[PDB]
Amino acid sequence: ENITQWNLQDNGTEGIQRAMFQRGVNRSLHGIWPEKICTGVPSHLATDTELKAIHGMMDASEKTNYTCCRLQRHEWNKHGWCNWYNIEPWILLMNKTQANLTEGQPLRECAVTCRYDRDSDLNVVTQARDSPTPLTGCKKGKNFSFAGILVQGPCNFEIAV
Ligand SMILES: *[C@@H]1O[C@H](CO)[C@@H](O[C@@H]2O[C@H](CO)[C@@H](O[C@@H]3O[C@H](CO[C@@H]4O[C@H](CO)[C@@H](O)[C@H](O)[C@@H]4O)[C@@H](O)[C@H](O[C@H]4O[C@H](CO)[C@@H](O)[C@H](O)[C@@H]4O)[C@@H]3O)[C@H](O)[C@H]2NC(C)=O)[C@H](O)[C@H]1NC(C)=O
Ligand SMILES: *[C@@H]1O[C@H](CO)[C@@H](O[C@@H]2O[C@H](CO)[C@@H](O[C@@H]3O[C@H](CO)[C@@H](O)[C@H](O[C@H]4O[C@H](CO)[C@@H](O)[C@H](O)[C@@H]4O)[C@@H]3O)[C@H](O)[C@H]2NC(C)=O)[C@H](O)[C@H]1NC(C)=O
Ligand SMILES: *[C@@H]1O[C@H](CO)[C@@H](O[C@@H]2O[C@H](CO)[C@@H](O[C@H]3O[C@H](CO)[C@@H](O)[C@H](O)[C@@H]3O)[C@H](O)[C@H]2NC(C)=O)[C@H](O)[C@H]1NC(C)=O
Ligand SMILES: O=c1ccn([C@H]2O[C@H](CO)[C@H]3OP(=O)(O)O[C@@H]32)c(=O)[nH]1
Ligand SMILES: *[C@@H]1O[C@H](CO)[C@@H](O)[C@H](O)[C@H]1NC(C)=O
Ligand SMILES: *[C@@H]1O[C@H](CO)[C@@H](O)[C@H](O)[C@H]1NC(C)=O
Q1: How far is the CA of 84 from the centre of ligand 1 (A)?
Q2: To test the ligand 6 pocket, which listed residue (7, 25, 26) has its Cβ within 8 A of the most ligand atoms?
Q3: Which of 1.10.357.10, 3.30.470.20, 3.90.730.10, 3.30.300.350 is the CATH number of 1-161?
């Protein structure tokens, strides 16, 4: 029921993706999204110390030189507090999810946002998730590149029929 989304390195994409390519990082966690989105005053103010414990997860913000902890705090505020109640279980999950992402191509990896590269003739996956979803910026008929890994379809498993 929870969507796990992450960023993948792409020099062709200004922002987090360019920074990941430079830093030799393949997959950086974006968030874990339950059905319920949090509204109102959070239960706990996520400190940088707490948020730095999610090892390997880069910030999508230029303001922190794509390090910590803007994206991280945003995630706890919008998706974390009202669903996990405590920061400790949330931190451990986010970190274990990022640990697994650092290992390599996940069991379930589906393109979310693409950036078609005319030179290589590939759909360079900028963001991916553990469930198939309507694509964005993807050219139909072209193969996919998930941080260097070439896949025929938008997912690393069969969806259809
Ligand atoms: C997918 O997403 C859901 C959230 O959307 C995750 O579910 C949460 O999981 C965490 C644990 O990983 C749970 O946190 C613990 O909640 C306890 C309170 O729960 C009450 O019972 C039900 C659960 O059936 C809730 O729905 C109620 O609202 C209640 O409030 C809470 O006591 C507990 O704290 C205890 O443990 C921690 C660490 O061990 C201590 O720090 C703490 O002080 C205390 O002893 C945790 O906060 C949470 O209940 C879940 N919430 C819901 C709504 O289901 C899934 O596990 C995610 N799964 C995947 C696979 O991504
Ligand atoms: C990864 O992406 C980065 C960012 O997009 C990328 O750098 C960009 O590409 C090029 C290649 O170095 C840079 O382009 C140069 O930019 C200056 C103006 O800023 C122009 O004057 C340059 O023109 C000369 O260079 C050519 C070299 O082949 C000549 O043939 C040409 O006629 C000129 O004399 C040139 O276009 C560019 O500035 C950056 N862009 C940004 C937005 O930073 C880099 O190539 C990629 N790295 C890897 C490892 O793939
Ligand atoms: C991160 O990746 C892990 C691997 O997918 C997974 O952790 C869980 O723990 C064990 C490792 O000890 C996996 O392997 C085990 O498989 C059998 C299955 O019958 C277990 O009985 C054994 O203990 C064995 O070593 C588990 O399969 C695995 N659990 C699940 C539910 O898939 C985590 O799920 C990953 N965490 C995140 C947050 O993505
Ligand atoms: O984890 C993240 C967080 C944010 N962005 C966003 O970064 C730029 C910000 O302009 C956004 O444009 P966009 O396609 O609407 O969403 C992009 C990511 O790509 N990954
Ligand atoms: C997060 O995972 C790393 C491995 O990537 C581990 O060494 C680290 O201390 C973890 N943080 C915790 C458990 O808070
Ligand atoms: C990342 O994928 C590259 C291909 O871009 C692979 O060769 C490498 O071992 C991985 N490096 C990481 C996860 O740091």
Answers
A1: 5
A2: 26
A3: 3.90.730.10
Helix/strand/coil for 64: helix
Header resolution in angstroms: 2.8
